[PDB]
Amino acid sequence: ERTTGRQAQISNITAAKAVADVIRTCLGPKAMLKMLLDPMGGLVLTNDGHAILREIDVAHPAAKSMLELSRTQDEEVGDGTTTVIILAGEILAQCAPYLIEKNIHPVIIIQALKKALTDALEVIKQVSKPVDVENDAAMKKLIQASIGTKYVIHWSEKMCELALDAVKTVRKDLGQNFEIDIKRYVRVEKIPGGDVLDSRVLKGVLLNKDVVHPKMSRHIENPRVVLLDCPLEYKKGESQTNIEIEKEEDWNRILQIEEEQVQLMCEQILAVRPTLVITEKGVSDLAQHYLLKGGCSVLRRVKKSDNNRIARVTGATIVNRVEDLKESDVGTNCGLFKVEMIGDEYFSFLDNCKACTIMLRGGSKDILNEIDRNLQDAMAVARNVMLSPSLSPGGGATEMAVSVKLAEKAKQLEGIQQWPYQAVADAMECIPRTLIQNAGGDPIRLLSQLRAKHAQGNFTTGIDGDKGKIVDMVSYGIWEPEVIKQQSVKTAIESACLLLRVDDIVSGV
Amino acid sequence: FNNSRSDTLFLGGEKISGDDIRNQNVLATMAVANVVKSSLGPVGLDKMLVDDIGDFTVTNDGATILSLLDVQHPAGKILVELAQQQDREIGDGTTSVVIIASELLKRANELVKNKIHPTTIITGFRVALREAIRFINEVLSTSVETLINIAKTSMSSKIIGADSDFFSNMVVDALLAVKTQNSKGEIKYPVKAVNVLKAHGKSATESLLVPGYALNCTVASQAMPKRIAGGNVKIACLDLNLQKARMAMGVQINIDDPEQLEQIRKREAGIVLERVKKIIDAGAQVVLTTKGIDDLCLKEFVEAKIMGVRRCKKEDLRRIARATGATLVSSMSNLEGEETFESSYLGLCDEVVQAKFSDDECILIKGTSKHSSSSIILRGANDYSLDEMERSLHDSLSVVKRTLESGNVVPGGGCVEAALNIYLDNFATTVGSREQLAIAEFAAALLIIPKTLAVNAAKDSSELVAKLRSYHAASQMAKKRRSYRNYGLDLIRGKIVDEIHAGVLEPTISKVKSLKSALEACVAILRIDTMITVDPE
Amino acid sequence: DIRLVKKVGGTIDDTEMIDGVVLTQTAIKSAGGPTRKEKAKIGLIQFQISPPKPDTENNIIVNDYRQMDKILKEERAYLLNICKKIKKAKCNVLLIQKSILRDAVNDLALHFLSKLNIMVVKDIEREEIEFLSKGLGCKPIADIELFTEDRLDSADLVEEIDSDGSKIVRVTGIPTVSVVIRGANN
Ligand SMILES: Nc1ncnc2c1ncn2[C@@H]1O[C@H](COP(=O)(O)OP(=O)(O)O)[C@@H](O)[C@H]1O
Ligand SMILES: Nc1ncnc2c1ncn2[C@@H]1O[C@H](COP(=O)(O)OP(=O)(O)O)[C@@H](O)[C@H]1O
Ligand code: BEF
Ligand code: BEF
Ligand SMILES: [Mg+2]
Ligand SMILES: [Mg+2]
């Protein structure tokens, strides 16, 4: 029913702490795969944090808040998902003692944490170095960084390629910020089989819809594309259109009219001399015929999302009513119209030998979803940099810097206001630690050394994954988008600040 | 213990009389109040309220806690509907109008147990209020920034308060910018404008205050522009829908000759198509219908790079239009014609852009002819905190609309309470009798706010409550020297301070209605002596 | 004859006798909002400003290309002239008696009545009529073809003061008192 007092507080903290506990063995280069079972049927074999926590229903309110943190974070940057959860926990946990043990009110611990966040954020931008968003080589060895710790690493280079080759493709600066809608303009397409490398980033689209009529062009050299909303069949009246006939030879009259309007429609289209007509709706058998000899291949039923991406790699602006069909609505700038038959399943291409279609190949419909998600992380950190050319010391280095500059300051602040501040510092340290642990090396040992080396000797010094020894980032490098280090710490400290505002929990609508 | 039986007077239900019921009422009000007595003050804290599905919401808005908390029992609902009155009237002061009410009953009841008729207690509380309301105008004052202050102290018991300075500013700013004259003078600050939005991402501080308005929509067809105008734009705030007509509900198209079939048919498309043209042909670069758009009659806007948004919030267009000076086009007519009248009905806006916010992406009409308007957009950790950020951004930003509309504030900090207390307390002897105990109780009862404002800090609040007590008790000795009421509590530090100086301001209009109201309840309940509960069906 | 109208909110003291009379309805959200007209002439239209409402099995058939707008543009005027005749008879504030039968004040007929700056107020219950004809000194108007300037009143002020989230109507300055009651709890 009800639970006021530290009772509340505790269960919240423990709850939140437990959330972390699950995916903590998923943060690191040697991170394991949490094969989860969804209710609907299938499975999820991913190790990408947010993709795990999504597939786990929780009860305790805090555990629900803690769980959605991984989502809002997966919405800002594509990466840094697992990290925010672990941090968001350790913060609450590291407050636990001064929260009750040292009887500090939640207002005070909040007043400090909100303060320690800003200072902490400084130390992030302070250690961050900028980068050439255009230097293909830098972007690659940047995207590569956030491809490690995932099944997609055995082709790491191959991945950053398909990543950049797609981030830049749908990009479109615009200024009067840079707009990169990976979502609506980079439709992926996972096709079972082949090899990983056998996957490319076609600059166009790929529909499996075949051709409306047999004897129709399998591939127009340079096709003239015409995209339209409206269907291709005899329309009807949006009023009480009811016909009364007693005039004998009138049946034939009307029944004919239908053929007649389908004709007109074919005309208006055929007019601008098209070779490829792709409509979102249907295609009357009649209309097929008049578009056959009219000289063009037809494609019926294609999703809006599928269509509007075509209209960016054909230029062919989509148009509804045909009696208004302009000639500006061309089909210029569009290579071939291949129709490769991929294992008993016909496809259609529209490459040009603004929106690309990443086509992945692996070894199962299952294994592909691993790739797709892994790729998304790549293609997202690429976008981040595109809109914030700043990077942060990976290997948990940044995380340790903030640990010290804060630890130092806290110790030199004096007042009850110090303890909560001190905790944010002590908290931060958990990431290089989770890393060192999931590496196998001795946490107490490596950290003391990493922390010390940090205290003076440079701040771009994190821990090396497969190794387990402290290395300098600059050295073997593994910087990550500075944006990630923003959110991870922004919302984590917020989460903590929210849950700490709770002193009572109640049940009933 | 436990009431029971019937014997005579056969009634289709329950019926408690006297002591039994009279206590039940007091217990009721008590419980419903005590749930939210731990949310009072800056040191007060929020709570999570889970349903049956498991979801929940964390919030300090006493009125929503009592709303969200299922209350079954008259005297329980009463204080949940009284907590409502406040949030509906002034807009803040909920959590407190209840705590007072409960305290008045609880107390008044005690007097009855002492053998003091309910009425004699009632008139007594009535006079304690007359004197108390009057006196309230002897601590208040005209606006002499008091605004960024009011807006701040109203965020103490809230989540938005850790970043007080920030929002306290964004609050007044946003509101002010929207003021109007309603009808015949007035000059009322929109009790609801400033479309507030929220989106998870970034810091709590990174909340933007649009320099115009935020309409929450995309752009119909992805084919049209996502940003238009840098200098000037013509906004078409419609209402009528641009989709393929359907004629009168009772207009059968009876065809006798196969000829007319095709003709009247395609006519349908054009009828509502002409309507489209007569609008583009006005300089319309931005169209904001309310009743949606066709995809046919959209391509017309697209072919012409006209940002045209479908089925918008009509509650926004009404304000998007007063803000671009435009006109909410109900239907192009005027006398007997048809046109959206080129720029006659259109609005002048500086720029219409579709800004993104991670996941989401909405439209902004920033900078306009006669807009003045604003709109805030919260950004937090997740929806749980976000709902609440706004939740209290409102319970705060409301305190401002009233400080404005009513130029008069009083020093909060549990000062008002303390003052009234000792004044009414001493004043209580100005009638003596049994009636003394009444006023006395009334006054004494008010010290609930200062006590509980502090007890929410764990420490032995008997300290401050004593100090603050004494002070006023003394100040009203030549109330002469250098009279100094306005002395409230500073729980953050644990000492009595001058709240007017410190910056703890609250509009008079609140504590004046919060009081007159809470008693109106207590009395209607004080008169309750038998509760007949009919059996339902 | 002593119409009391209780409105939730405030306390008991917030109750006044109200010089003129107290209506009970909203006003206009839709097309062009008037809601207040100083020195106005009101009319109790028992009529109904909607398209042609033939009490016998009516029906408008169509069978011509052009005939489309014929039907349309025509009734578009039907509502217009009625609206003019109102302004014409110098009718400032309009009052429509709730007709569940078949429409009261068409959505379109409001764009007109909007421009014409005529604050209309619908859903006047049938039991009111008699009474309103006193407090308002007004006169019931069966048809439009009987809607004349004399079948109106000398209203000095009509306004929907939003007391606070409440909104109550008033017709001040003009055998019928009209008191409004308030309090906290229902
Ligand atoms: N190559 C690596 N060697 C050491 N640390 C790494 C390496 N790759 C990722 N990191 C660090 O581990 C974290 C990223 O791990 P990951 O498992 O990808 O979690 P997320 O889902 O947050 O990306 C960051 O702190 C990053 O600095
Ligand atoms: N800065 C402050 N210092 C001391 N008291 C404050 C301060 N901020 C608000 N108060 C007081 O706390 C009470 C309002 O807090 P709250 O619990 O939010 O009540 P409500 O929810 O009814 O506004 C009032 O007594 C107000 O005067
Ligand atoms: F492992 Be993370 F999501 F890239
Ligand atoms: F919670 Be209160 F109404 F500010
Ligand atoms: Mg990653
Ligand atoms: Mg408040």
Side-chain angles (χ1 to χ4, degrees):
Chain A
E1 178 57 15
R2 294 196 60 184
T3 42
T4 317
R6 300 180 307 103
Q7 319 311 313
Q9 303 183 303
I10 295 176
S11 58
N12 278 316
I13 299 288
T14 52
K17 198 183 177 305
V19 171
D21 273 33
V22 208
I23 40 71
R24 303 186 67 276
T25 77
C26 286
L27 166 89
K30 294 171 114 69
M32 299 312 277
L33 285 46
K34 247 64 176 169
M35 185 203 295
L36 311 113
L37 255 183
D38 65 66
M40 294 306 273
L43 9 286
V44 169
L45 191 23
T46 248
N47 90 259
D48 180 285
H50 179 51
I52 293 176
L53 288 71
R54 199 205 306 91
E55 294 297 341
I56 291 170
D57 190 37
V58 312
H60 192 111
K64 271 174 122 50
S65 148
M66 277 293 303
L67 211 67
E68 196 186 305
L69 281 157
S70 173
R71 194 182 71 188
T72 75
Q73 160 78 40
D74 189 56
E75 291 174 326
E76 300 308 302
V77 269
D79 207 275
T81 195
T82 46
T83 349
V84 61
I85 295 295
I86 310 193
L87 200 70
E90 185 83 349
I91 303 167
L92 277 149
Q94 278 293 331
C95 281
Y98 327 104
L99 206 202
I100 42 172
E101 188 74 294
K102 228 83 169 64
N103 199 185
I104 307 173
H105 190 296
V107 172
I108 311 171
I109 307 158
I110 282 180
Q111 299 304 307
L113 265 132
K114 53 152 189 169
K115 184 176 185 310
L117 171 274
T118 25
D119 302 44
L121 263 161
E122 177 52 60
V123 178
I124 300 174
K125 184 157 285 298
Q126 167 56 56
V127 310
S128 298
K129 69 189 231 305
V131 76
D132 181 354
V133 291
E134 300 305 318
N135 189 311
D136 278 13
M139 278 308 280
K140 289 180 190 304
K141 221 175 187 185
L142 172 152
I143 292 175
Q144 166 231 275
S146 72
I147 268 298
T149 88
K150 273 97 165 308
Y151 173 69
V152 82
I153 203 172
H154 298 95
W155 338 80
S156 184
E157 192 178 61
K158 172 63 168 191
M159 231 57 258
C160 324
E161 190 178 301
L162 304 210
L164 267 169
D165 186 49
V167 172
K168 308 184 76 181
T169 299
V170 300
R171 196 248 260 74
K172 37 189 279 62
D173 36 35
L174 276 59
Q176 286 209 312
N177 297 63
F178 220 42
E179 181 171 0
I180 318 176
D181 183 23
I182 25 188
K183 157 54 201 167
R184 287 177 298 207
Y185 302 154
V186 200
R187 212 67 155 190
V188 201
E189 211 60 51
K190 302 183 292 192
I191 301 172
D195 202 305
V196 162
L197 311 328
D198 288 354
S199 62
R200 287 305 323 183
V201 189
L202 189 93
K203 252 75 71 179
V205 317
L206 200 169
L207 278 52
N208 64 306
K209 276 262 58 175
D210 187 18
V211 61
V212 86
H213 179 282
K215 219 172 76 179
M216 204 163 275
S217 170
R218 282 295 189 173
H219 73 148
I220 297 290
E221 186 55 53
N222 273 52
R224 304 260 296 163
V225 193
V226 190
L227 308 172
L228 39 159
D229 279 356
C230 37
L232 315 186
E233 37 203 312
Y234 170 66
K235 311 289 179 302
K236 294 161 198 172
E238 281 62 34
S239 271
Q240 291 189 289
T241 303
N242 198 195
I243 282 180
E244 296 205 46
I245 66 178
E246 72 288 67
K247 27 196 311 209
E248 184 194 52
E249 31 53 55
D250 204 312
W251 179 260
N252 265 286
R253 277 228 280 278
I254 1 174
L255 229 173
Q256 158 81 65
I257 318 180
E258 291 164 359
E259 251 115 346
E260 292 205 298
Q261 184 178 49
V262 185
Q263 203 178 72
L264 153 123
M265 231 166 268
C266 289
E267 310 286 19
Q268 341 246 186
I269 302 181
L270 240 46
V272 293
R273 282 126 57 271
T275 11
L276 200 60
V277 189
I278 280 177
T279 180
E280 303 198 49
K281 288 225 63 179
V283 181
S284 200
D285 300 289
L286 196 287
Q288 291 169 46
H289 193 49
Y290 295 3
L291 284 167
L292 166 103
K293 76 97 191 74
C296 70
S297 289
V298 214
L299 262 56
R300 74 155 100 196
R301 305 273 156 50
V302 180
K303 193 190 190 305
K304 260 293 189 65
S305 312
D306 285 357
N307 184 287
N308 288 190
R309 257 189 312 280
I310 296 173
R312 294 170 57 68
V313 202
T314 56
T317 47
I318 328 84
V319 179
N320 204 299
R321 212 177 82 283
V322 272
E323 283 88 7
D324 246 40
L325 170 47
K326 316 227 296 175
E327 228 297 65
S328 72
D329 309 335
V330 287
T332 49
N333 197 72
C334 171
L336 330 174
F337 178 60
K338 301 282 290 174
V339 59
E340 339 241 5
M341 183 206 105
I342 293 310
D344 301 319
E345 179 70 1
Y346 314 132
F347 287 158
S348 304
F349 293 48
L350 278 189
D351 64 52
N352 308 171
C353 289
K354 267 291 128 301
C356 58
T357 175
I358 306 184
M359 190 189 88
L360 308 176
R361 310 298 256 69
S364 170
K365 339 196 201 310
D366 279 299
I367 308 172
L368 287 174
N369 329 295
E370 217 60 85
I371 315 166
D372 192 61
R373 171 49 203 189
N374 273 359
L375 200 44
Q376 233 69 57
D377 285 284
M379 272 182 60
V381 287
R383 191 186 105 94
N384 300 323
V385 188
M386 291 289 165
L387 286 68
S388 287
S390 203
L391 312 186
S392 306
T398 308
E399 285 84 302
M400 183 56 99
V402 52
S403 177
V404 201
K405 275 86 169 192
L406 280 181
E408 188 172 58
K409 190 190 300 294
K411 230 294 180 174
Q412 191 73 71
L413 248 166
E414 313 297 287
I416 284 180
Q417 285 263 308
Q418 179 176 299
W419 287 293
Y421 199 111
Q422 183 74 65
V424 178
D426 319 319
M428 287 295 334
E429 196 173 56
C430 72
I431 277 70
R433 185 158 49 233
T434 305
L435 263 42
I436 181 63
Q437 283 156 176
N438 291 200
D442 185 271
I444 21 170
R445 274 161 164 58
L446 284 306
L447 276 175
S448 170
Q449 184 178 26
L450 188 290
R451 189 173 169 68
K453 274 283 197 306
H454 227 96
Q456 302 176 317
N458 202 185
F459 43 46
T460 60
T461 61
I463 299 180
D464 191 298
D466 316 300
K467 287 190 172 183
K469 65 155 293 178
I470 55 165
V471 192
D472 178 293
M473 269 322 114
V474 196
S475 301
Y476 75 108
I478 206 68
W479 287 278
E480 53 210 26
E482 190 200 310
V483 277
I484 284 155
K485 303 289 87 175
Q486 308 288 288
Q487 271 312 74
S488 76
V489 187
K490 286 176 184 293
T491 66
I493 305 294
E494 262 197 286
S495 146
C497 244
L498 173 60
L499 297 164
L500 292 188
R501 276 206 68 76
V502 160
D503 85 305
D504 179 31
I505 308 200
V506 194
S507 213
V509 203
Chain B
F1 193 74
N2 175 83
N3 205 53
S4 184
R5 302 290 302 182
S6 289
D7 299 307
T8 342
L9 178 110
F10 306 65
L11 247 64
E14 293 292 63
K15 173 227 177 198
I16 348 166
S17 63
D19 316 330
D20 300 313
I21 167 64
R22 202 174 275 285
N23 256 62
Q24 210 193 73
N25 296 320
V26 174
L27 299 169
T29 63
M30 267 299 126
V32 71
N34 285 302
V35 187
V36 302
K37 210 167 286 193
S38 76
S39 120
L40 193 68
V43 293
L45 314 84
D46 289 54
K47 45 174 81 308
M48 314 175 165
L49 317 186
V50 182
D51 47 36
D52 301 47
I53 311 175
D55 323 307
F56 57 103
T57 9
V58 27
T59 284
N60 189 289
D61 199 2
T64 37
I65 304 165
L66 300 194
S67 181
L68 203 163
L69 174 48
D70 177 62
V71 184
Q72 305 212 306
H73 184 296
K77 292 188 194 71
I78 276 176
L79 299 214
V80 172
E81 222 166 295
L82 183 69
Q84 206 64 79
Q85 171 86 53
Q86 202 77 321
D87 213 290
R88 289 183 309 89
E89 190 93 43
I90 70 188
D92 184 82
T94 51
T95 304
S96 296
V97 63
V98 189
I99 302 170
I100 282 179
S102 92
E103 199 48 35
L104 287 158
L105 254 196
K106 170 187 167 191
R107 284 267 212 281
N109 190 72
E110 284 312 301
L111 289 176
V112 226
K113 302 185 173 187
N114 291 339
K115 319 315 295 176
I116 297 165
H117 197 289
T119 63
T120 55
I121 301 171
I122 286 177
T123 54
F125 277 36
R126 231 123 188 181
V127 83
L129 180 56
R130 294 162 191 177
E131 250 56 57
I133 259 299
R134 201 189 60 181
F135 187 100
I136 282 305
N137 305 303
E138 275 43 76
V139 288
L140 55 64
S141 69
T142 298
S143 183
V144 301
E145 262 281 39
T146 293
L147 245 202
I148 317 171
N149 246 313
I150 280 286
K152 199 174 175 184
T153 60
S154 71
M155 310 187 299
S156 303
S157 82
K158 313 290 178 55
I159 183 175
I160 177 181
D163 301 357
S164 61
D165 282 293
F166 176 95
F167 288 96
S168 53
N169 245 290
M170 165 176 277
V171 166
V172 280
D173 286 340
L175 201 218
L176 298 167
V178 208
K179 56 190 300 303
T180 306
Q181 323 82 180
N182 179 57
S183 293
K184 276 214 288 288
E186 206 72 10
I187 305 302
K188 200 189 287 297
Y189 288 73
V191 69
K192 33 208 177 50
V194 184
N195 203 191
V196 218
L197 262 62
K198 61 173 189 67
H200 40 201
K202 309 203 150 301
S203 300
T205 164
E206 306 201 18
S207 301
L208 64 147
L209 194 154
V210 184
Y213 204 77
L215 193 159
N216 200 295
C217 283
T218 55
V219 283
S221 276
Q222 231 74 78
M224 53 188 90
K226 304 197 177 305
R227 172 190 182 64
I228 239 173
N232 238 216
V233 67
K234 308 187 183 177
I235 292 181
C237 299
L238 318 188
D239 175 294
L240 227 292
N241 72 316
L242 341 189
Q243 325 177 311
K244 301 173 73 297
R246 302 218 148 81
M247 289 287 95
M249 277 187 84
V251 67
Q252 283 92 302
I253 282 179
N254 202 327
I255 297 305
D256 43 326
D257 37 48
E259 60 203 30
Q260 284 306 320
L261 183 57
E262 294 283 1
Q263 283 166 55
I264 52 184
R265 259 198 44 212
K266 287 193 286 297
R267 183 60 204 301
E268 203 155 47
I271 310 158
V272 289
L273 185 27
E274 281 167 46
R275 320 252 168 295
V276 173
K277 307 272 198 170
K278 309 180 190 180
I279 297 181
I280 305 174
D281 310 319
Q285 318 157 56
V286 150
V287 207
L288 304 181
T289 186
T290 222
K291 286 195 288 181
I293 300 172
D294 210 306
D295 53 296
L296 169 157
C297 314
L298 247 188
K299 175 276 307 300
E300 286 289 307
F301 290 115
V302 186
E303 206 92 68
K305 301 178 177 179
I306 309 166
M307 217 165 270
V309 179
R310 52 194 305 87
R311 252 172 301 270
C312 301
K313 196 172 172 285
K314 178 167 176 290
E315 334 287 0
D316 278 347
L317 260 36
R318 160 182 301 92
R319 294 181 288 197
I320 284 285
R322 303 172 313 93
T324 76
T327 313
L328 277 168
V329 197
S330 340
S331 175
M332 316 168 302
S333 206
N334 212 60
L335 273 179
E336 338 72 41
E338 282 202 294
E339 73 315 304
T340 189
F341 231 140
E342 51 172 294
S343 188
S344 310
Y345 290 163
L346 291 262
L348 284 181
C349 153
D350 190 292
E351 83 139 312
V352 157
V353 76
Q354 186 169 71
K356 196 187 183 306
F357 294 94
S358 87
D359 173 56
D360 281 42
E361 180 183 356
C362 77
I363 304 293
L364 286 170
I365 292 175
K366 46 166 64 183
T368 350
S369 57
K370 161 43 199 317
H371 55 153
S372 330
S373 64
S374 65
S375 168
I376 307 178
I377 289 177
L378 297 318
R379 310 225 63 189
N382 60 18
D383 294 289
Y384 283 125
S385 68
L386 227 50
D387 287 14
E388 169 55 20
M389 286 185 161
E390 146 186 45
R391 181 132 274 307
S392 60
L393 167 59
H394 181 318
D395 261 68
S396 154
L397 171 148
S398 249
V399 192
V400 171
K401 302 184 188 186
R402 328 302 279 233
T403 308
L404 268 45
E405 298 169 51
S406 158
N408 244 299
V409 289
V410 189
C415 177
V416 201
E417 285 77 22
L420 287 162
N421 159 72
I422 202 57
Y423 166 68
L424 293 167
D425 207 352
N426 268 267
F427 170 72
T429 325
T430 67
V431 178
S433 183
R434 184 170 305 289
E435 197 200 309
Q436 193 184 69
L437 292 205
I439 305 172
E441 281 313 326
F442 184 104
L446 287 117
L447 295 191
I448 180 159
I449 292 281
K451 280 195 246 291
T452 78
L453 265 165
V455 188
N456 272 299
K459 205 171 182 287
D460 251 68
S461 314
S462 42
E463 167 189 52
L464 271 60
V465 170
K467 211 180 186 176
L468 161 55
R469 238 284 181 180
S470 285
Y471 274 85
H472 280 81
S475 84
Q476 268 142 61
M477 237 48 262
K479 197 204 295 287
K480 48 84 263 160
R481 177 47 68 173
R482 41 56 239 117
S483 182
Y484 61 118
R485 67 297 175 183
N486 306 325
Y487 263 27
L489 304 173
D490 175 49
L491 322 167
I492 356 178
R493 290 169 144 286
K495 58 187 181 186
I496 281 63
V497 54
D498 183 301
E499 308 285 47
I500 297 192
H501 181 71
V504 204
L505 321 183
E506 194 151 47
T508 69
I509 161 175
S510 165
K511 294 191 165 169
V512 167
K513 164 53 184 51
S514 188
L515 240 134
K516 172 56 187 272
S517 176
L519 184 63
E520 181 102 316
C522 179
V523 184
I525 289 180
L526 240 275
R527 304 179 60 68
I528 302 175
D529 92 323
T530 285
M531 191 208 281
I532 290 174
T533 315
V534 201
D535 297 339
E537 312 89 331
Chain C
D1 297 336
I2 301 185
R3 165 187 285 213
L4 294 165
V5 191
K6 54 200 168 187
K7 186 53 63 286
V8 56
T11 70
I12 302 159
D13 180 47
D14 300 11
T15 53
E16 49 204 309
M17 199 235 102
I18 294 299
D19 172 279
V21 298
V22 189
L23 242 188
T24 10
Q25 297 84 305
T26 340
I28 326 83
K29 168 176 181 168
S30 198
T35 88
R36 172 191 235 164
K37 248 288 181 291
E38 343 216 10
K39 214 149 193 171
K41 285 195 183 300
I42 318 167
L44 281 192
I45 258 286
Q46 296 203 296
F47 193 26
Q48 46 163 61
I49 310 171
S50 66
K53 291 277 155 277
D55 312 88
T56 316
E57 270 242 62
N58 78 63
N59 234 185
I60 319 167
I61 295 289
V62 157
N63 56 307
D64 298 308
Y65 179 53
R66 47 196 154 294
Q67 190 169 24
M68 238 57 268
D69 314 274
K70 185 189 181 186
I71 339 295
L72 164 52
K73 309 303 191 287
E74 219 154 54
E75 67 165 66
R76 287 176 59 81
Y78 177 32
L79 285 68
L80 201 291
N81 84 93
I82 293 176
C83 293
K84 179 195 170 180
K85 293 190 185 182
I86 299 159
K87 244 315 302 153
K88 199 157 68 181
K90 288 296 177 183
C91 176
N92 189 321
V93 187
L94 190 63
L95 290 180
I96 289 80
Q97 176 196 61
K98 162 184 175 171
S99 298
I100 57 289
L101 351 177
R102 223 152 305 180
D103 206 286
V105 176
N106 194 296
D107 213 347
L108 166 46
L110 285 158
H111 314 161
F112 298 174
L113 274 164
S114 139
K115 288 292 191 191
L116 318 212
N117 189 282
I118 295 179
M119 169 191 44
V120 43
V121 155
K122 74 170 176 180
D123 297 316
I124 303 294
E125 292 296 348
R126 328 195 65 127
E127 337 308 314
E128 281 187 304
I129 300 298
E130 281 50 60
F131 178 77
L132 284 200
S133 282
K134 242 298 172 189
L136 255 47
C138 193
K139 186 63 189 56
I141 327 278
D143 199 275
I144 173 64
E145 194 200 89
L146 265 146
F147 186 42
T148 50
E149 189 184 54
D150 60 311
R151 315 287 253 297
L152 302 186
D153 53 89
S154 58
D156 267 31
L157 170 56
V158 173
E159 44 100 81
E160 185 174 69
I161 168 182
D162 191 316
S163 301
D164 210 324
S166 90
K167 286 278 192 190
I168 58 183
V169 172
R170 276 206 247 296
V171 173
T172 176
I174 34 178
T176 149
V177 47
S178 289
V179 179
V180 162
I181 322 166
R182 286 185 184 285
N185 223 293
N186 246 55

